[PDB]
Amino acid sequence: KTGFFKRLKALTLPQKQLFATALCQRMLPNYQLFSEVCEFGDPAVLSTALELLWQSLYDPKLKFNIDVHLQRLEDNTPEPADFEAYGVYPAMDAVVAISTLLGAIQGKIEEDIVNISKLSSSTVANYIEAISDVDLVDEALDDFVFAHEVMEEEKELQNSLLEIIEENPKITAELVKGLRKDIIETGVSNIGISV
Amino acid sequence: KTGFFKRLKALTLPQKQLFATALCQRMLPNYQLFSEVCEFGDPAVLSTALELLWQSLYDPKLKFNIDVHLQRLEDNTPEPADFEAYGVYPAMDAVVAISTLLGAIQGKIEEDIVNISKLSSSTVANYIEAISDVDLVDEALDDFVFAHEVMEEEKELQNSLLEIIEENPKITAELVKGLRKDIIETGVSNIGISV
C-alpha cells in the first residue's frame, strides 16, 4: 500500500479541508473539559469557529471574517505557564488546530491542513508520554506508544477517515454531514475525553 | 436497581472467584509491558498462576501448592522505589491482585475476592489522576475521572462481567471458558495496554 502521508497529500484541497475539519471537531471535548475544570476561556468561540468550518464545506456562497475569529481564538488560547493541570496542553492543541486550519484556508496553505494530522496524533503521544516517564527512543518508543489503545484508536480513526474521503473524488454534502454527525454523536476526543 | 457492590457481595464464592479471576487476567498486559520495558521480573510466573486459577474454576479435583506460587509472585513484585517509569504501579497492582486472589482462595476470604473489583478500578483512576494534576475532590473528581473513556470502559466491563455471572445460579465450564477466551482474545488491559 501507499503511505498514509503520501495519500493525505494526494487529496484535493477540499478533501484535505474536510479531513482536518473532522479532526478538529473531535478535539473539542478536550477544550471543554479543561475550560470547565480550570475555569478558563469560552468553548463557544471554538464551536462557533467549527460550525463555520463545517458550513464552508457545504456552502460555496459562505463568507465570514476569518481574522476576527482568529483573534478570538487566540484570546481563548491558554498559556501553559498559568496552569498546573495537564489539560492545558490538549486544550491549547485544540484551539491551535482550529486556528491553524482557519489560517490555512485563508492562505490556501495545503501543508498546514495536512499537518493537522500530526497535531492530532502528537496530542495523543504526549498524553501517553506525560505519564510514562520511560527512557525509550526512536522505534522502541514508537512501539511503546502504540501498545496503548488510545494511540491505536487514533491511527484507526485517521485511517478510516482518510479512506472514506479518498474513495470520493469530490466532497459531497452527504459526506460532510455524515462525518460531522458521526464525530459529534460519538463525542469522544482523541485522548478519550467526553463532556 | 440494586448497587454494584451489593450485587457483587451477593454472589456465591465460586461466582466471586470467577469475577475476580477474569479481572486479574485482564491486568496481565500491564505486567508484561512493564517487565519488558523496565527489564524486570518474569511474566510467566503470573500467567502460570492465572492458568491454575482458571483450572480451579473448571476442575474440582485440582490441587496445587499455593504458598509456593505466592512466594514466586512476591519475588516478582517490583518496588516503586526502584523505578522511575510509571508502569511499576500497574505492574505491581497486577501481581498483587493475583496474590490477593490466591490468598483469598486459600483462606476462603470472600471480602478480599470482592475487593479485587476496587483494585482494578483504582489502577484506572490512578492512571488518569497521575497525569491530570487537578485540584478536584470528592464528587467533582469522580465526574472528572469518569469523563475519561478508559474509566467508563472499566465500569462497563465490570458491570457486564457481573451481569453474565449473576444470571447463572452456578458457574459452568462453558461460562468459565467463554469468559477466559473473551478476555484473552481482546488482550487489552484495564488501562488500555496490549502487548
| A84 has a chain B CB within 8 A of its CB | yes
CB count, 10 Å around CB of B184?
Answer: 13
Q: What residues contact B166, with CB distance under 8 A and at least 6 apart?
A: B7, B10, B11, B15
Separation of alpha carbons A152 and A144, rounded Å? 11
Separation of alpha carbons A37 and A85, rounded Å? 9
Contact A131 B127 (CB under 8 A): yes
Beta carbons of B117 and B158 less than 8 angstroms apart = yes
Separation of alpha carbons B1 and B7, rounded Å? 10
Convert B125-156 to b/e letters by CB count within 10 Å (16 or more is b).
Answer: bbbbbebbebeeeeeebeebbebbbbbbbbee
| B126 has a chain A CB within 8 A of its CB | no
Separation of alpha carbons A130 and B194, rounded Å? 19
Task: Please name each of the domains of chain B with its CATH number.
Answer: 1-195 (1.20.1590.10)
Separation of alpha carbons A170 and A11, rounded Å? 10
Question: Looking at this protein, which amino acid is placed at residue A88?
Answer: V
CB count, 10 Å around CB of A63?
Answer: 8
Of A131, A149, A188, Cβ closest to residue B131: A131
CB count, 10 Å around CB of B34?
Answer: 27
Question: Looking at this protein, which amino acid is placed at residue A132?
Answer: S
Q: Find how far residue B148's CA is from the centre of its chain.
A: 20
Distance from CA of B172 to the nearest CA of A (A): 32
Closest CA to A148 of B105, B49, B13, B188: B188
Distance from CA of A84 to the nearest CA of B (A): 7
Beta carbons of A48 and B96 less than 8 angstroms apart = no
Resolution of the experimental model, in Å, one decimal: 1.9
| B128 has a chain A CB within 8 A of its CB | no
Contact A192 B130 (CB under 8 A): no
Question: Looking at this protein, which amino acid is placed at residue A26?
Answer: R
Separation of alpha carbons A95 and B162, rounded Å? 41
Burial class (CB in 10 A: 0-12, 13-18, 19+), A2: exposed
| B75 has a chain A CB within 8 A of its CB | no
Helix (H) or strand (E) holding B166: helix B149-166
Long-range contacts of A139-142 (CB under 8 A, 24+ apart): none
Helix (H) or strand (E) holding B115: none
Separation of alpha carbons B67 and B58, rounded Å? 21
Question: Looking at this protein, which amino acid is placed at residue A149?
Answer: E
Contact A37 B136 (CB under 8 A): yes
| Experimental method reported for this structure | X-ray
Mutual angle of helices A149-166 and A13-38, in 10-degree steps: 150
Query: How many residue contacts between A and B have a Cβ separation below 8 Å?
Result: 64
Beta carbons of A167 and A7 less than 8 angstroms apart = no
Q: What residues contact A68, with CB distance under 8 A and at least 6 apart?
A: none
Tell me the CB-side half-sphere exposure of residue A110, using CA atoms within 13 A: 10
Contact B147 A194 (CB under 8 A): yes
| A194 has a chain B CB within 8 A of its CB | yes
Written as nine digits, the cell of B58 is 473448571
Q: What residues contact A34, with CB distance under 8 A and at least 6 apart?
A: A40, A41, A78, A85, A87, A88, A90, A91
Beta carbons of B83 and B38 less than 8 angstroms apart = yes
Written as nine digits, the cell of B28 is 496481565
Tell me the CB-side half-sphere exposure of residue B166, using CA atoms within 13 A: 15
3-state per-residue secondary structure call for chain A? CCCHHHHHHCCCHHHHHHHHHHHHHHHHHHHHHHHHHHCCCCHHHHHHHHHHHHHHHHCCCCCCCHHHHHHHHHHCCCCHHHCCCCCHHHHHHHHHHHHHHHHHHHHCCHHHHHCHHHHHHHHHHHHHHHHHCCCCCHHHHHHHHHCEHHHHHHHHHHHHHHHHHHCCCCCCHHHHHHHHHHHHHHCCCCCCECC
Q: Report, in this order, helix, strand and coil percent for chain B, each rounded to 5.
A: 75, 0, 25
CA torsion B32→B37→B38→B43, rounded to 10°? Answer: 20
Beta carbons of B88 and B113 less than 8 angstroms apart = no
